[PDB]
């Protein structure tokens, strides 16, 4: 079976080399694409706008993002994926021949397993959710049967253009293989379609949120400990993304599996706290609820303040402190977006 993996890996290496040699002028564009395709944006800028435009779409988007990322982490641990930027320097394949010369970039060195691709899955799920929601909302046009079809065609072309751009960006930076991005896209599509039939998430008590979060934490930690007690470790990539990196400062703690898990669980718990609170009821379910200026002000403030607040970086000297502070920091963005800032605007606008 290893021959097939070698064949796909060699095809990915050749694709990366061709893209890097024949299109040397597009490195800035692909770096920008990879930066934009981050889930940080999905949690910081995409969620507030959709939540303050239509609550159900925002809740669905956040749930899809968090659950898809958790499933991605679990399947990354299960599948034992690889990356080109250390495989090309570690493999025995290019022994009787010449090693292809692929170049590494500051946003290339990643400390997690390869398949499935996280960027492709995370972007596919969120953008499918947004496109489907928009198409569902706009079934009210003046002249139908050609204008609605025009909008449908335009949106479904844009979605696939975005997906192709993200796949090419991940391949160019020598961070993923061509099959991993396709698998990630299909998995994100499947997850976004599966959450279209689950309805016991829009009105859930804090007890259910707490139990779901604790189960998600405990399953991952128990999986890690159970495997660690049987002779296999799921953190083997931290020693491969360290020697095979051109510069030492390019390897960051922010991309480790524990950091991602803690951030996801913090976001979910923060949403659970924000939804079941007195401030949320007093602000988002009052007289200034559907008023357009209030919602626009909420979007603007929750964008500006969140952008400024993202500049507070927890210390990385001690790993446990970093993890707990990452959880606490990720638990705040739902809170500030949903409960606090709308409350402040409610006591500002309607209290003269
Ligand atoms: C069409 C797509 C639309 C999606 C929205 C794109 C927003 C991009 C963005 O906000 O860039 C932001 C950076 O972005 C980052 O900071 C990247 C995350 C890295 C931060 C560190 C990781 C932890 C800054 O860009 P802007 O000045 O806010 O515009
Ligand atoms: O492996 P990919 O597809 O290049 O993306 C990996 C990224 O996927 C994201 O889901 C994780 O939060 C990041 O920590 C990780 O770096």
UniProtKB/Swiss-Prot annotation:
SUPFAM superfamilies: Acid phosphatase/Vanadium-dependent haloperoxidase
Transmembrane portions of the chain: 29-49, 61-81, 118-138, 148-168, 180-202, 210-230, 255-275, 292-312, 321-341
Enzyme active site: 119 (proton donor), 176 (nucleophile)
Enzyme class per UniProt: hydrolase
Binding, substrate: 83, 170
Enzyme Commission designation: 3.1.3.9
GO CC annotations, alphabetized: endoplasmic reticulum membrane; membrane
Keywords from the UniProt entry: Disease variant, Endoplasmic reticulum, Gluconeogenesis, Glycogen storage disease, Glycoprotein, Hydrolase, Membrane, Transmembrane, Transmembrane helix
Family affiliation: Belongs to the glucose-6-phosphatase family.
Function: Hydrolyzes glucose-6-phosphate to glucose in the endoplasmic reticulum. Forms with the glucose-6-phosphate transporter (SLC37A4/G6PT) the complex responsible for glucose production in the terminal step of glycogenolysis and gluconeogenesis. Hence, it is the key enzyme in homeostatic regulation of blood glucose levels.
Name by which UniProt lists this protein: Glucose-6-phosphatase catalytic subunit 1
Gene name per UniProt: G6PC1
